[PDB]
Design an enzyme around this catalytic site. Structure first.
Site, PDB file in Angstrom:
ATOM      1  N   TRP A 130       2.987  -8.092  24.984  1.00  0.00           N
ATOM      2  CA  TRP A 130       3.216  -9.101  25.974  1.00  0.00           C
ATOM      3  C   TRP A 130       2.658  -8.560  27.291  1.00  0.00           C
ATOM      4  O   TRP A 130       3.076  -7.504  27.750  1.00  0.00           O
ATOM      5  CB  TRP A 130       4.708  -9.277  26.042  1.00  0.00           C
ATOM      6  CG  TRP A 130       5.054 -10.369  26.947  1.00  0.00           C
ATOM      7  CD1 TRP A 130       4.583 -11.619  26.847  1.00  0.00           C
ATOM      8  CD2 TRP A 130       5.924 -10.337  28.090  1.00  0.00           C
ATOM      9  NE1 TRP A 130       5.107 -12.397  27.843  1.00  0.00           N
ATOM     10  CE2 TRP A 130       5.916 -11.633  28.626  1.00  0.00           C
ATOM     11  CE3 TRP A 130       6.712  -9.347  28.709  1.00  0.00           C
ATOM     12  CZ2 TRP A 130       6.671 -11.961  29.755  1.00  0.00           C
ATOM     13  CZ3 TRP A 130       7.469  -9.665  29.823  1.00  0.00           C
ATOM     14  CH2 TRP A 130       7.447 -10.963  30.343  1.00  0.00           C
ATOM     15  N   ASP A 211      13.271  -5.266  23.820  1.00  0.00           N
ATOM     16  CA  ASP A 211      13.016  -6.411  24.627  1.00  0.00           C
ATOM     17  C   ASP A 211      13.442  -7.518  23.670  1.00  0.00           C
ATOM     18  O   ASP A 211      12.837  -7.712  22.623  1.00  0.00           O
ATOM     19  CB  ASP A 211      11.543  -6.519  25.049  1.00  0.00           C
ATOM     20  CG  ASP A 211      11.265  -7.807  25.767  1.00  0.00           C
ATOM     21  OD1 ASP A 211      12.058  -8.704  25.781  1.00  0.00           O
ATOM     22  OD2 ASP A 211      10.105  -7.890  26.377  1.00  0.00           O
ATOM     23  N   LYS A 246      14.761 -18.798  26.573  1.00  0.00           N
ATOM     24  CA  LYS A 246      14.288 -19.537  25.464  1.00  0.00           C
ATOM     25  C   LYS A 246      15.374 -20.117  24.593  1.00  0.00           C
ATOM     26  O   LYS A 246      15.354 -21.312  24.312  1.00  0.00           O
ATOM     27  CB  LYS A 246      13.232 -18.648  24.757  1.00  0.00           C
ATOM     28  CG  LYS A 246      11.831 -18.519  25.451  1.00  0.00           C
ATOM     29  CD  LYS A 246      11.672 -17.171  26.188  1.00  0.00           C
ATOM     30  CE  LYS A 246      10.352 -16.954  27.007  1.00  0.00           C
ATOM     31  NZ  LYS A 246       9.950 -15.463  27.024  1.00  0.00           N
TER      32      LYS A 246
HETATM   33  C1  LIG Z   1       9.671 -14.614  28.021  1.00  0.00           C
HETATM   34  C2  LIG Z   1       9.686 -13.147  27.722  1.00  0.00           C
HETATM   35  C3  LIG Z   1      10.401 -12.103  28.456  1.00  0.00           C
HETATM   36  C4  LIG Z   1      11.209 -12.365  29.758  1.00  0.00           C
HETATM   37  O1  LIG Z   1      11.522 -13.734  29.895  1.00  0.00           O
HETATM   38  P1  LIG Z   1      12.416 -14.255  31.029  1.00  0.00           P
HETATM   39  O2  LIG Z   1      11.789 -15.529  31.289  1.00  0.00           O
HETATM   40  O3  LIG Z   1      12.240 -13.224  32.175  1.00  0.00           O
HETATM   41  O4  LIG Z   1      13.787 -14.201  30.532  1.00  0.00           O
HETATM   42  C5  LIG Z   1      10.380 -10.780  28.054  1.00  0.00           C
HETATM   43  N1  LIG Z   1       9.706 -10.429  26.943  1.00  0.00           N
HETATM   44  C6  LIG Z   1       9.044 -11.323  26.175  1.00  0.00           C
HETATM   45  C7  LIG Z   1       8.344 -10.814  24.954  1.00  0.00           C
HETATM   46  C8  LIG Z   1       9.039 -12.689  26.573  1.00  0.00           C
HETATM   47  O5  LIG Z   1       8.349 -13.507  25.745  1.00  0.00           O
END
Ligand SMILES: *Cc1c(COP(=O)(O)O)cnc(C)c1O
Ligand SMILES: *Cc1c(COP(=O)(O)O)cnc(C)c1O
Lengths: 396, 396
Positions: A130, A211, A246
């Protein structure tokens, strides 16, 4: 003072949203940013969330600052989603959770904490990964090294290469794992791969950092936590950055958590005091709304029931768009076989399209996907499926 | 990995709330943290806010991520409060505003921006100041140097002492100013002093950073922005970190802004892009709730009207309590003369009690004030005034 500041490069994900916005082309299709859309193509507020909101509207009597670490119920509830109802981690008071502004702020909090209080010098992230991971860690003055992970040829997890690259991870180095629904690949280790990985890390001396942004989008809530839970069983120390953006569709309210795990209560307490200090020097205290929403839902059987179903619905609908995507592709030309797309978890598929192919989809056809070839399955609908599958075929 | 982490020291402010929370003592009195209380002793949600919240509850259809810089209209509105509705900075498209998580988040954002995109090495802050200022700057790797400011013997702003202090400040150094309601002293520069400072910093080559957390608590919305605005007329560049925690009582929703001003638009744009980058690497995007509340209120004439009245009400009630505070003290046999307290603005008073007197006030009487002698006037009520005033007398 600012005369010589160079413009920075746009976020490779956030960016496109801009572009997207700016594009007047009538039938544009947005498969970039990871947002869950619905049959109608809208990004709705969950019903369990609107309910929780009315409840607050009616019951909130103060906007008094929260504690550095946020809403206690919230951390409690997070610890249970994460480690499970009766974890020893919980009973032994070994974990402390700080409510943060998204999983994003959780990552930063963890980074700052690490950089300033441990002798952690480097963080290992997967390749691909990511995009924002590098920036977060780098900003805290940590080095990011990458470990092999995906098999382009076979569309799968290359366990050996995984293992063979982590061999260079020194003891005390941080290793970042995606809890479930690997972003961008959609390929997760099997429970057994996890158990192995967990044995290895203990043996090798790594600090795991999970994560966890998609709990509930692979198989289910509990199921999605097995890898972590496996790690939590062998590890003395861990960090978990998790998000509710999400799974609760609370994207803009910035709801996430940073959980610190230590051998014991005294240790986790001391250590967490420093994590709190790091938050103070940052945003001070976290935003209440989102998290209140979350704590309300999770601690009320009924709302929680409603919520679990919406999530299930969300997960299911993505699964359906998955099979429909492979089918429509086939049924529409497609030289390649995209079947591997069905064994991927979460919102995205790593489609295997080339950078020029994605540029072209955008430019020519108006379909937005990330330059890595990552498409957001949750953004596909029965109504846009055809036109979307056509554009892809024309670029093959 | 955490075995050796040292417990961090407590927050002179924050940690005092804990202490408070924990004491079983019946008639305790909280004069520490800066919260506005009402006649009845509670920390209420403004009705303009509750109104705005219903409105959102009813009209929100998605929780879609906001832009890194947040709600646009929120930024618009912020700029006009700050600079003028009318201002050139606005017409000239010379200012860019990022919505952030509190004024605190805005400070961190600015620090990170500076530390990485400019040659800034030191940041100058008044003595005394708001404790958190040093931690935020130090975290970004910036050095904090202090400039004289308060005349303890006389209870005023020691101007030449200030000026002779900053003379030590190099060109390209950041100089931090409190927009109004200096925390913790309550002493602000007169418009002519401001003008002087402004001319002086242009000449000395200092980059000004305004911390503006109390707009509307001294004299008024528009008037409290006078020093800033005088700086804004002479400067090419400056930074403004503002908060809406206090004037809107949105403490826990984390509402603030970071405003960047450059010689011109081409420049403010390039620069802002690096600021956005610093945010991406932090919490990514800001929390919507609080900010939507603020933008709704500021956008609607009705609501705005209601809101301004509530704010004059709060300011007026604090003015009242101050008069009451000196009288009562007097009427209770105070040694010292406390009239200077009348000449200070905002939520606090720098009472002049010593470390030991404040310690004593708490253990013994359960009255909570900051070790610096800072008392939160907005926490006094007609009902607690007596008991409060008696505890003080007892310690003098
Ligand atoms: C969306 C995402 C995050 C952090 O999302 P927030 O919108 O800050 O809660 C962290 N890691 C991954 C892999 C993500 O897809
Ligand atoms: C309250 C305050 C801030 C920041 O407050 P937030 O709640 O973070 O908006 C910054 N500076 C001063 C002087 C303050 O009093």
């Amino acid at each position: 003072m600012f005369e010589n500041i160079t413009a920075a490069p746009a976020d490779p994900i956030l960016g496109l949203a801009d572009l997207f916005r700016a594009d007047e082309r009538p039938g544009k299709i947005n498969l970039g940013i990871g947002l869950y859309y619905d049959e109608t193509g809208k990004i709705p507020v969950l019903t369990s969330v609107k309910k929780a909101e009315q409840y607050l509207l009616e019951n909130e009597t103060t906007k008094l600052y929260l504690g550095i670490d946020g809403i206690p119920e919230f951390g409690r509830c997070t610890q249970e989603l994460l480690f499970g109802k009766g974890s020893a981690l919980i009973n032994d008071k070994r974990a402390r959770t700080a409510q943060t502004p998204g999983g994003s702020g959780a990552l930063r909090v963890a980074a700052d904490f690490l950089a300033k209080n441990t002798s952690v010098k480097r963080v290992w992230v997967s390749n691909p990964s990511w995009p924002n991971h590098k920036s977060v860690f780098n900003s805290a003055g940590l080095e990011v090294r990458e470990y092999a992970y995906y098999d382009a040829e076979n569309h799968t997890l290359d366990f050996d290469a995984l293992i063979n690259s982590l061999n260079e991870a020194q003891a005390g180095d941080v290793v970042l794992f995606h809890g479930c629904c690997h972003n961008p690949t959609g390929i997760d280790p099997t429970l057994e791969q996890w158990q192995t990985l967990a044995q290895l890390s203990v043996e090798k001396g790594w600090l795991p950092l999970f994560d966890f942004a998609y709990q509930g989008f692979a198989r289910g809530l509990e199921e999605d936590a097995e890898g972590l839970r496996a790690f939590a069983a062998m590890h003395k120390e861990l960090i978990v950055a998790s998000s509710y953006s999400k799974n609760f569709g609370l994207y803009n309210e910035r709801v996430g958590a940073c959980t610190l795990v230590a051998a014991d209560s005294e240790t986790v307490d001391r250590a967490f005091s420093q994590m709190k200090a790091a938050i103070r020097a940052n945003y001070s205290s976290p935003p209440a709304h989102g998290a209140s929403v979350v704590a309300t839902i999770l601690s009320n059987d009924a709302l929680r029931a409603i919520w679990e179903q919406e999530l299930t619905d969300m997960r299911q609908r993505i699964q359906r768009m998955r099979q429909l995507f492979v089918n429509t592709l086939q049924e529409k030309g497609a030289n390649r076989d995209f079947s591997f797309i069905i064994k991927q978890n979460g919102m995205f598929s790593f489609s295997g399209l080339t950078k020029e192919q994605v540029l072209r989809l955008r430019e020519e056809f108006g379909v937005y996907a990330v330059a890595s070839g990552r498409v957001n399955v949750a953004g596909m609908t029965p109504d846009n499926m055809a036109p979307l599958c056509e554009a892809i075929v024309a670029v093959l």
